[PDB]
Each structure stands twice: as C-alpha cells, then as structure tokens.
Amino acid sequence: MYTFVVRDENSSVYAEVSRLLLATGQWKRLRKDNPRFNLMLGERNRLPFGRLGHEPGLVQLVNYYRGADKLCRKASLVKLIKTSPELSESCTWFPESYVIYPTNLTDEREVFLAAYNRRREGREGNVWIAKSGILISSEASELLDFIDEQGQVHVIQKYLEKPLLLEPGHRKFDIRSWVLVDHLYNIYLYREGVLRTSSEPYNSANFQDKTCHLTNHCIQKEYSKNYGRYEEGNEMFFEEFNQYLMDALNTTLENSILLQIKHIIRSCLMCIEPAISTKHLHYQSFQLFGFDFMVDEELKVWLIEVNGAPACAQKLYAELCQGIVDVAISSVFPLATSIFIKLHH
Amino acid sequence: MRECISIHVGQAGVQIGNACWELYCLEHGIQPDGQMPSDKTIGGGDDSFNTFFSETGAGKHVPRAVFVDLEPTVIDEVRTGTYRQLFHPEQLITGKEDAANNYARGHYTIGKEIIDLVLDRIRKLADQCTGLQGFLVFHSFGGGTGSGFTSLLMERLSVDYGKKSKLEFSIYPAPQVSTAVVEPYNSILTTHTTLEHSDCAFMVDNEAIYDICRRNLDIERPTYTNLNRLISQIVSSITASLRFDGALNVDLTEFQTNLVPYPRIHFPLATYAPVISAEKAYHEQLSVAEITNACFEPANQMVKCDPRHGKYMACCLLYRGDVVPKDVNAAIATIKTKRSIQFVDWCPTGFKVGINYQPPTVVPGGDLAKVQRAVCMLSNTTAIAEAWARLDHKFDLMYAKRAFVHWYVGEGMEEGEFSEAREDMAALEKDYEEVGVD
Amino acid sequence: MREIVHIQAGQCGNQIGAKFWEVISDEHGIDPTGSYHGDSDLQLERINVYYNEATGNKYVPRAILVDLEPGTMDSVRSGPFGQIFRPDNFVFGQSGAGNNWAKGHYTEGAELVDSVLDVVRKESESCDCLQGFQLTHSLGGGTGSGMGTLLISKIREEYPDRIMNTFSVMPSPKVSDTVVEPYNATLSVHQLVENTDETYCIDNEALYDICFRTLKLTTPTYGDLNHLVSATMSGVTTCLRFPGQLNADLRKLAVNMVPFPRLHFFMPGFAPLTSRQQYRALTVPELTQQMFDSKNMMAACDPRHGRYLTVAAIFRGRMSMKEVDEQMLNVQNKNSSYFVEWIPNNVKTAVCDIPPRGLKMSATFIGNSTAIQELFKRISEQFTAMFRRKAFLHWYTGEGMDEMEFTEAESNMNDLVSEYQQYQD
Amino acid sequence: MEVIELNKCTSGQSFEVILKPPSDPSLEEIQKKLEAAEERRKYQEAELLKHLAE
C-alpha cells in the first residue's frame, strides 16, 4: 500500500493523477504535511527538496526536477542556451534573444542594440517582441521604454515575421508538446500534441492589436471575435494538422515538423542532465514539461519557451495522466502500445 | 612544533575518540603500551607527531586528549581496553549520572557541577605545551552531554584560551541509530550557544555513515564500531596535516583561513573515497581521477545534500597514498568540464591540494580494505544548509506543541532559550541563502 | 551502578510482585536461595540494578513488601522464591484496609508508613547511584491503592529528583472484588497524575479477555492473570536489566516517552501469546503484527480509537536485526494516521539477545497512546453512577474523608481525559 | 589551469591550482547563567515541597 501527499491543489494535471492513484485501491493519500510518503505532488514554488530522501525505509519520489527552472524561466533559458557549448550561441532553432534588466536595477542592452542597428541598416525585418504583459514593436525605443516602466527582468527576442499560416483563415499558431522525464532520465514525448491557433487573420502591418499575433488560449477566448470557428476552442490536434500538411503541402507532420521537435526536446533535456539528474541521489525525480514551438513558412521549427508546470488539453487529460502513472510512478512503485515516444539520450 | 589537545565529550565523542587514537597509534607506529621504537629522541622531541603525543622519560607516547562523560559506562571501556596504558587516569573524567538526553540537564544542572574540574584537567595538559594551537572537540548533537556540556565547555575555553583555535567534529542526529526523540531540540540548542565559539566544525551525519557502511561495506545492520572506524578514517585524513610533515593545513588557524571566509558559515562538507570492503575477494584499485570524481558524488559525503544546487566558497583535496600532482590536475580538468561546480563570485575558483605519500592505514580485522590511494575533500558548500533545514523543520513540529519542553524548563532553562536558539538558526539559514542563491 | 528500589504493596501488588521477581531471578541465574548458577556474563552485567550483593556471593532483591494484613505476605514467604527476599523488608500490619482507599491513605496506612520509609531509606543509603523507584500495586483495593499512593507522596517528598515508576492494575467490573473499586481507582489516578513519571496501566479486563479468548483458558484465575503481568514486567524492564543503551535509563525512557508531564500512562503489550501449536517458530513479521494488535495489549484500549504520542518496542532473542527494522518501519508506514506527525520519529526499537524462559524470541510493546482515555472514561462512568447517589460513601466519610475530596479527584481525572482528546486532534 | 606554491618534502607535497579568479560571555556572565538556572530549579523544588507539606 503506497502513500502520497498533495501540495499543489491548483494542478489540474496531478489532481487527475491523484484521482487515478486512489482508483487503483493500492495508494493512500496523507495530509500534505505528513512526511511518511512514497510520492510527493509538490508545490510549484519553494519545493523543499532538501527534506526528501531522509526517511528510513521509504523510497521517496517527487514530480519535479530540482534545477529544471534553468529551462523553464524566460531569462534562464536565454542564458543557458548562450553559455552551454551543447547549445552554443549559434543554436539554429532558438530565436535571437537578449536578457534586459530595467534601468531601475549581466545585462545585454548594448549587445541587443548592436544587432538591432545591424538589421535597421540592412533593410531587413526588424520587429522584436518583449516579454517576461507583452509588447510587439519594430522600434527599439518602444521595447526598451516598455521594460523600464516595469520592475522585473524582461527578454527581447526576434519576432518571427514569417509565421506559417493555416488556411483558410490566414492565421498564426503554436505547437504544444508534453514531455515526461522519469527517474531514470528517459525522455518520453506524448504521441498527442495540440495546436493553439489564432482565430484571426495574421496582419504584419499592425502589431498594436495583439490578438492575431499572440496564440494564447486566454487571449483568443477573451479578445478575439472568431473564437471556435475553424476548430473547437482554437485547438487543432495532430490528426487534423497532419491531414492538412498532406493536402496543402504534400508532406507529413513527422517529416516536416516532428523530427525537429524531437531534436529540440533531446538537446535541451540532455544538456542539463548532469545538473538535475537524480541517478545517484537519495531521492528520485520525474517531471512533465510543456514545450512551445513556432513554425515559419519554411517549415522550420523554433523553440518559444518551456513550461515547468504545464496544463493539458481537456481532450487529452485521461490518456496522458494514465501514462504518467504507468511510466513515472508505477515504474518505481509497481502495482499488484505505449502512448509515448522514447527519445531518451 | 605546536600542540593540539583533543577533547571527547559524551558517549559519541568518547567512542569516536577511542577509534581515532587506535588509528593514530597504528599510523605513527605507537604500540598500545605507548612505546614507539622509531622515535630515536627518548623522553622528548619536537616531531610532527608530537603535536598529538607527549613523551615521558620512559619513552611512553601519551595522547594530548581529555575524555569527559557524565556517566562512567563508556569511559570505563577505555580504562580496561586495549589502549588502557596510553592514557593516565587524570585524562579520563566520569560523573555518576548522565544528562538523560537533555541539553539543559547537561548544560546547567550537571554541567555547573563539573565544569571547573574538566578545565583543571585541560589546564594540566596545556601546561605541558610550549606553544598550544587549540583544541579539537568531538561530540554528538543529540546527546544531553554531547550537546549540553560541550556548549558550556566551549564558552569557558574561549574565556581561558582566547587566542586559541577550536575545531569541532559533531555527530548530526539520524533516526536509524538514535533512540532519543528530543535530539532536534538538543542540536539547535547546542549549535546556538556554540556557534560563536567554533572556528570550524565538521558535521558527520549518521545517516550518511550508516548508508556508506550498508552500501560499500555490505554490512546489513552496522553497529557503532563499524561507524566509528569509518569516521576515524575521515578524521585521520583531516588531522593528518597536523601530525605529519607537510605544508598545507599545518596548524589549526589554516583550517579557518582555507575553509571559512565568513565566520558563521564554518561547516565544511567532507567527502571520502574509496570505501572498499575487506570481505571483498577481488577489488580493482581506483585511479586518481576515479577517486577524485567520487568526491562529487552524494553517496560518499558525510552529509547527504546536493552541492550541484549550492555554491562553493572553498575546496581542499587531501590525498593519501600513491598520488602525484600531475594526475590530480588531470582529474580536476576532466571534472570541471563534466560537473556542476559553482563558486561564489567573491572567491577564486580553485583547489588547495595536499598529498601525503603514506596510504591510509586500516585497523587489523577491520571492515575497510587496504587501498593504494584515497582522498578526502573539504568543501564549504551552501548545500550543507539542507541539513539545517531538515533539523529546523523537526524542531518546529515539536515546539509548536511545546512537546517535551517541560523536561528542559524543569532543569532550570528558560523556555525563551528555545525560540532564541531557533531564531539564530533561522538567521544561519538566511545567511546561507544570501551567499548561495541568486 | 544505577540501582532501582522495588516496592510492592497490597494483595494484588505483592502477588504480581512475587511472580515478577520469580521471573527475572530465573533470567539472571539466581536460584530461590539467592545463589547465581547462570552460564552467561550478560546475566550479571546489570544484576545490581535490581539486586544487592551479600556475603557468600548471594544476590538479594532490592524489594520492599508492604501490606496492612499478613495474609498475602505469609504466602510469599512460603512461596517458591520466598526465601530470597530480605527478611527485614517485610513490613505489614494486622488491621487490613477493607478495600478502602481512605484506610490505606489516611488512617490504617498512616500508622504504618513511617516504618516502610525506614526500609526504603536503608535501601537507598546503600545505592551507589539510585535511579528511582518502581511500585507494583492495584488501584481497586485499599492498601496498594490508598497506601501505595501515600508512599509515592512521601517518597517524592524525600527523593524529589528521583524517577517514580509504577505498574498499576486498573479495576474492571468483569474481574471485580467489591463495588467500590471505581472510587478507589479514581482517587489513586488523581495521585498518579501528579506524582509519577511513568505508570504502566494494566487493565484486569484485558488480562481476562486475553486468558479467555486468546490463551483459551476456560476459567482464568488471578494466578493466570499474573502470569501475563510477570511476562510483561520482565519485558518492559529488559532495557534496564541487560547491557544496552536503547532505553537503558529510567530517566531517559521518561524523556523519550513523556511529551507532557500529565500524559505518562502507558499501554503495555507482549507477543507472542500462544495457547497449548506452542512450539512453532515465530517469524519477525509475526512478532511485529501481534505486538501491535490490540488483542495483545493490556490496557483494554483499542489503539485505533486514538493516536500514538510515543512508542517503545523491545525485541528479545537472536533474530535478524535488519528484519526487525524493516518490520518496525512497515508498521509505521502502513498506519501512519495512528501516529502524531508533530513528534518526528516517535517509535524507538531496542533489541536484546537473551530471550525469556522457553522462547526463541519475543517482543514487548510500550505505547503512550491517547486511546488510554477510554480506560479513564470507563472508571469515570462507573464512579459517577454511584457518586451521584452518594452510594457507599459512608465507608470513606467514616475515615474522615469529605465529599469534596471525591469531587476534586473526579475533576482532575476528567481533565486528564480532555487533554488526551485535544492531542488526539 | 595554473599551479602555485608547490611544496615538497620526504613525506608528501602540497600545491594550489587556480582555475579562475574572483569577481563572548565573560567568566562572570557564565556564572550568572548557571546560578540563575540553579535558582529556578531551587524555586520549583521549594514549591513542590510546599505543596507536599500542605
């Protein structure tokens, strides 16, 4: 009879895992402060890793990798890619990015301006985006002034002015991929991904109305007037997307996009493996990651960000959460056609 | 030559002391009767080993050590044991009844009535030293004597020997080999009143020693004898620079200068390798690179914690055996490219290295195998704060209900000392976070 | 040389005490004449904890036999090990206490207490370092209950810093001698809450149920019940009588078992308990399951009705000490809702190689559970049923007691129940 | 990767490798603590003996 505790009540994902664990009749839930647990579904912030793996007779597991924030923080990811030889500053699948601190506080203000002026002089497209509340502009003066008005670190990266547009609609989109890393550091990619599409036509002559540039489900369902027109909830799944790529582009999702995604997932996770692996550690870690990608008109895949506490598409909670129990939990606490793709090392 | 006086307080300190001097004698060729054939200067001499051993006219080499326990059971083992002849009776001090795992009982009640006697005996050893460096204090966190009486003894030593260095070897409590539920109280109480009096303290978590014995030595249920022989190997590696000719950590002051840039953060993490079982019929000897690499594995640290998520302030490599500098640097280069070693910005990113050609000595019939080379790494990592967090957490659970507090108050301690000692630990935790995290 | 002074008072106290000395004398190789005839040095290692050493290498128990009538103590002096007890340590009167707490505490007992304390002082004066005292008595009668608690009060006055430890037999209507047992028990508990550091609560009902349902004794007797208490007393004092620093000190056990001064009432337990399939080997898992089973406990309190503040477990015999830890951790980790989470690592396990007579291995259980409140709830109910009608009070008012003294004792015991209840939540 | 302060002797050698540069209570006061605690113990015991005498 295995035991576990829950320390993030707002997690839709592990709320389902917690619901499935009890359904097996072989798992018991303890108060969130009881230390005699086998499994911790811990908080997002200030997870007390230092108190794990010190209970005699209990093999303890946790659903977060200590140190993964280096990958899931906007500023950290920029620094990690530039300073890691495994990724190098010449990394081809990540938009040119710079870490910029507000003047009221190293910083790459001058380094950014140099690349900016280079584009302004070369007649090239010089439209960047700021984020940490987002601002898209082609003038460097606006981007820096918007950051100083705030009080937190910001990141300015090149805005993909040539995004791949679905048809009909002439609309942008981003791809979300769920990746699970188990205690042995096998990298599993969920066979099911989602496209978060913009229900508005892409217009490169007006970065003021951010509803056709930002594909967030929250911005589309609140500020967009064509919500749920082409697909239910501005969410297209791989089956439909792949059929589209065959009809319009005579190619497959695997060849044109998925190979690049798998290569990006591998590169990021294998890079930080020495820093976060729990192989020879007194406790074990696993974690679910949400990778966000962009696709340009050349069918090149770009990495946007990595989410450490991702949610899931309502239509995919059942399959995914069960797969989290099979490969991540039951593999350490066994019970009395996999849905994942092994990209590990 | 400057002498070092060792003080062993409580059961853990005394039994660990027994293991160390057994080792020191084997290392220096001293027989149990105190004789040392290799010593050609009879009755005296200012050799390196004389920092720990004095000499009588009859050629006996006597440890510069004091054993103190509030109950006689453990020290009586020394009086009639193998090394009964090493010490004279003045060096073995015992009371009638112990502190009952109660800090306040050891510090106030019983401590007040035997503190002056211990100092007088220590004064006797001090009067035999032409240039005393300081003291090495062995004790447990959890015991009522190890915690309560040590903190009082440290206060007085700072009074009677102000310009002297004081180092600690402290046993951090571990439930797998403990039967006292109040050890979190005693640990925090003694760290509070001892913090300003210790220049450098090496914590040894029994949970770590216990697992190394089960994992590397294949001991199903390790005893105190198993644990203490391993602990004395680490202690020997740390004190070797004081007992043998050398140029690194040659006096107690160098431990602070090399390992403690900030006075409160004086708890270096110790890592030792290799630990090979003597019952192992077949063993492949590890290289300089392999044992140096093992110094960055949590499984051989004296305290389980993840230095990958802390920052280093200092780092010492103490090798014993067949090791030359060339191989050390080669292993260090390879480890920097593969390991997560982050130094604070206000510190150089380097390593002070020490090599003693004499390989580690192993007690006949002991559990450890004779290896051709070993290393002990002393690094001041902020990651060691994990041990304070765990301990402080257990303190908070019990103190929120005032559980067991009446035992301490009944011994004359004021309840406010609990919260006072707890807020100091909260500051110690904050200081670590200020130095390490960004 | 951490000596303990044993005191046994009253009928129950002396018959259970007699068997206890018979049991442990056997474990230490002491025969009925006090001569050591053992084959192991472990037997003599801590022998002076419970025995004085006389001339001719004789060992005399450090026990004081107290009673207000001669009857029971004459039986001891004529019993198996009767010759072993110091002749001077028999202190008895002739009046009796008539199962009347007031007679043992205020009138008959008061006339005899000084001479008992003269023997206690003589035994303490020859102790190199006296740990404390242990008293065996019942709470339902008059001498053990009323005079027993008078002795504790006077011992505490003369030895205020020594540990006071008792084995207290709690009355039960199912194994009752008189109807006034709740009166005598409620008055004693009032004393025990204030003046003892550790009290092992032994419910005569549990002892009966065990003899009937488990041991399959058709018609249990007091002798049959006392066999269980002897075996239990031998187990809980293993830590003290043999080499080992687990709970080796009387004061260390109190520090580790008592988080609050008033909550020092323990549920003892023992495994195995087998009916005559009596030669079968018992595996370590089996020992642990039984030792935690309510049917193996002697307070007649289901631990599942409350939570454990602290737990001490002792294992005797040659067994896999690795397997012991594994099973002790399996019990806590499989029922962690029955242990308070604000006392980390509140279960301590000790081992001893020497098993009891005729057993390859055994385990004794010492639990400080809030479930013990149900024991005081029963006593309190029976008390109030009579006291609301002032029934049988004249036996007590006739000895000079006032009804007020009954009300105060009742309130304090009810407060004790309320304190167990608040820490259970 | 630099080596400095190489010291060699018959029983061993020591050196330093730099990979990258950077960027009490008096005797009297103790007596009061102890005696203060002892007094509080004496007070608690006097109250006990007072309670017993009553």
Ligand SMILES: Nc1nc2c(ncn2[C@@H]2O[C@H](COP(=O)(O)OP(=O)(O)OP(=O)(O)O)[C@@H](O)[C@H]2O)c(=O)[nH]1
């Ligand atoms: N590593 C190691 N730890 C020990 C040893 N002896 C005791 N301990 C630890 O010390 C703690 C208990 O403190 P002790 O040193 O035994 O008690 P004390 O210092 O003698 O003080 P008293 O309460 O008066 O007995 C427990 O956590 C034990 O695990 C030992 O020989 N080696």
Ligand SMILES: Nc1ncnc2c1ncn2[C@@H]1O[C@H](COP(=O)(O)OP(=O)(O)CP(=O)(O)O)[C@@H](O)[C@H]1O
């Ligand atoms: N370099 C770039 N070029 C073009 N569009 C970009 C871009 N960077 C971000 N975007 C747009 O911003 C959206 C993603 O925003 P981002 O993920 O940084 O904010 P966020 O983290 O609060 C939402 P989530 O974490 O749920 O994906 C995408 O829809 C994408 O279209």
Ligand SMILES: Nc1nc2c(ncn2[C@@H]2O[C@H](COP(=O)(O)OP(=O)(O)O)[C@@H](O)[C@H]2O)c(=O)[nH]1
């Ligand atoms: N277990 C046990 N209980 C007893 C024994 N004798 C009496 N009792 C119980 O003790 C209570 C009577 O007290 P008793 O010891 O006879 O009175 P006292 O001689 O005046 O102290 C009743 O609850 C009895 O059930 C005995 O030998 N064993």
Ligand SMILES: [Ca+2]
């Ligand atoms: Ca000499």
Ligand SMILES: [Ca+2]
């Ligand atoms: Ca000082």
Ligand SMILES: [Ca+2]
């Ligand atoms: Ca009379």
Ligand SMILES: [Mg+2]
């Ligand atoms: Mg995000």
Ligand SMILES: [Mg+2]
């Ligand atoms: Mg001790």
Ligand SMILES: [Mg+2]
């Ligand atoms: Mg009777």
